[PDB]
Every structure is written in C-alpha cells, then in structure tokens.
Amino acid sequence: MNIFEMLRIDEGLRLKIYKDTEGYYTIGIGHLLTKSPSLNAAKSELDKAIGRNTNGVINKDEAEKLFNQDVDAAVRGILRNAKLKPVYDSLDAVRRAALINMVFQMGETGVAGFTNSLRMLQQKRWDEAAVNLAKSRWYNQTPNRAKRVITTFRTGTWDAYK
Ligand SMILES: [Cl-]
Ligand SMILES: [Cl-]
C-alpha cells in the first residue's frame, strides 16, 4: 500500500463534476474545484485546470494527472509549513502517509490547527493522539474515513486499508 492507493480508496474516482461530502464542486480523485455554488464557476475552474473545454467531463488520465499534482502539492505544503514539517520529520513512513492524507482532505491550514494532536504525534503517544483526533468536526462529519486515518496513526500499519 502507498499514499496514492490509500487516497484512491478514500476519495474514489469520478469523471463527471460531483459534489463532495460538504457540498462542493469536485472532480476526479477528490480534486476540489470551487467552493462557489455555481456549476458554471465549477466548469470554468475545471477547464482552466485541464487546459481545454471540458463541458464538465474528463478522462482517467486527466483525473490522474490532477491527482499527481495534488499529492505533490500536499507533501510540499507540509514541508514548507513550520508547524507541520517537524511532525512529518519525526514520523515513520506509514504515519507520514496518514498526515499527507489529512492535508489532502483538509488543507494545510486545517491540519495545522490540530495543535494538541500534532504534539502528541510528535511525542509518539499513539493511543492519546487517536483519542484527541476523534474530538473534531472532521471525525464527526466523515467518521469512516477519519477512523481509517486514525487507526493508521495508532498502529503504524496499513491494517485499516486492508
Ligand atoms: Cl489546478
Ligand atoms: Cl466517511
């Protein structure tokens, strides 16, 4: 298992514009297009992202390309972030995947706001961090995906995904 296969299981793949769990316009592998209510603002963003007139539909390759850019941006955002970097550096390879996952879903700002859990992860207090992570809107809103990520942090293995 790796970060790509991990996120592909969590986000799924859709080749037509859809609305995410929060109601925002998304396409492909969890690629947020816009937070605006307008399907037209979404189609515009889409065409801009792909470099062609898409009429709201993309092919697999295009979806995968967006996905590659997004994972790359996620990692690089972690590395440039003063709060996140030290956490990432301290972690093993599996747990690094778990933080990348959170960043991909909720953005660098959002994750960086989990101050207490971050400190617990850094100290390698696994069970405590899992309990703290669960007291969040995140876990309450997407509990199945959250539990999987949390288990990855608790255990350090890919069990939740197998
Ligand atoms: Cl983009
Ligand atoms: Cl869920």
Please tell me the distance from the alpha carbon of residue 109 to that of residue 70, in angstroms, as a whole number. Answer: 16
Please tell me the distance from the alpha carbon of residue 78 to that of residue 86, in angstroms, as a whole number. Answer: 9
Active-site residue (options: 10, 11, 45, 70): 11
Q: 80 CA to middle of ligand 1, Å? A: 19
Q: 34 CA to middle of ligand 1, Å? A: 11
CA angle 114, 162, 159 (to 5 degrees): 50
Residue 8 near residue 31, CB atoms below 8 Å:
no
Q: Is 140 annotated as a binding residue?
A: no
Alpha helix segments (H runs only) across 26-161: 39-50, 60-80, 84-90, 93-112, 115-122, 126-133, 137-141, 143-155
- Residue 20 annotated in active site: yes
Q: What is the resolution of this structure in A?
A: 1.8
- Give CATH for domain 1-162: 1.10.530.40
